[PDB]
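Summary for the lay section of the report: proteins are chains of building blocks that fold into shapes. Here we show the chain for nuclear factor XNF7 and then a coded description of the shape we predicted for it.
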Amino acid sequence: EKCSEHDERLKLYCKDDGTLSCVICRDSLKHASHNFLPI
Ligand SMILES: [Zn+2]
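The coded shape description reads as follows.
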């Protein structure tokens, strides 16, 4: 999961997959559209 420097516990991924743009960290808090990858 990229989503680096941003939440003290949130890290995740979206990318095309039926749901365009989703939780930017399994929740999307203080992220908005930064970036993240899936474990
Ligand atoms: Zn994040």
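Put simply, here is one thing we learned. The chain has no helices and no strands.
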